[PDB]
Amino acid sequence: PCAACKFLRRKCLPGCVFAPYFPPEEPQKFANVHKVFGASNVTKLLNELPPHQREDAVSSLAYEAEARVKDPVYGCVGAISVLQRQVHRLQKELDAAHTELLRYACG
Amino acid sequence: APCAACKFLRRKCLPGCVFAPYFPPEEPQKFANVHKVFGASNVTKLLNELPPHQREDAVSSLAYEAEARVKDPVYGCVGAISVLQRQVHRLQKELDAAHTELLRYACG
Ligand SMILES: [Zn+2]
Ligand SMILES: [Zn+2]
């Protein structure tokens, strides 16, 4: 029984569409995804993808869902905002450093 | 005029519609993306998990996340995080090296 069928009460049949990606030892993975995206959407979105991309797709969904559970307002957009601010700060600092270095290089 | 959610769902946008303050008619693709990725029912319930003063930010985040998954159906906005993780590390390395070079100009 995969994590999905355990959660969903149903028997986990050969070819259960979640079993390849929701093992029972990771209950949190399916609970978060179901709460944020919904089991039906996930089946729909996985069917739209090449089979060889579905493992990475599930991993991304699980990451996004977990971030949504722990930060209901921003989810992982919060991380993106934090990282974008730090890029800006560092690029500003690098600007000053590069001009200082260029002045030294000119004698 | 019905909000973008009610126009998409082909239902009457009534006074008190939970979507109307956040899905204006001028931005139909915003709702279409959020509906595809999260679903109207999930957004309805999340919006009611939140106080009024956070709903606008929540929808903004959902919209960005859904648009990212339309553009990148595999990784979504996690691809952005991966890129930003690499870039921050790289810029920090470059800045540390520049500070080291500056000190050698003054001391070495
Ligand atoms: Zn199963
Ligand atoms: Zn409406």
Q: How far is the CA of B78 from the centre of ligand 1 (A)?
A: 26
The residue behind tokens 């986990």 is: A12
Nearest residue, CB atoms, A90 vs list B62, B81, B88: B88
Specified resolution (Å):
1.9
d(CA A28, CA A88): 35
Of B38, B50, B57, nearest to A36 by CB-CB distance is B38
Q: List the one residue out of A37, A29, A32 whose CA is nearest residue A55.
A: A29
Radius of gyration of chain A (CA): 22
Reading the block at residue A73, the tokens are: 């307002």
Let me know: does A1 contact A24? Beta carbons within 8 Å. yes
Q: Where are the alpha helices (DSSP H) in B1-108?
A: 4-9, 28-37, 40-49, 52-71, 78-106
Verify whether the Cβ–Cβ distance A72 to B46 is below 8 Å: yes
Give me ligand 2 centre to Cα A73, in Å.
21
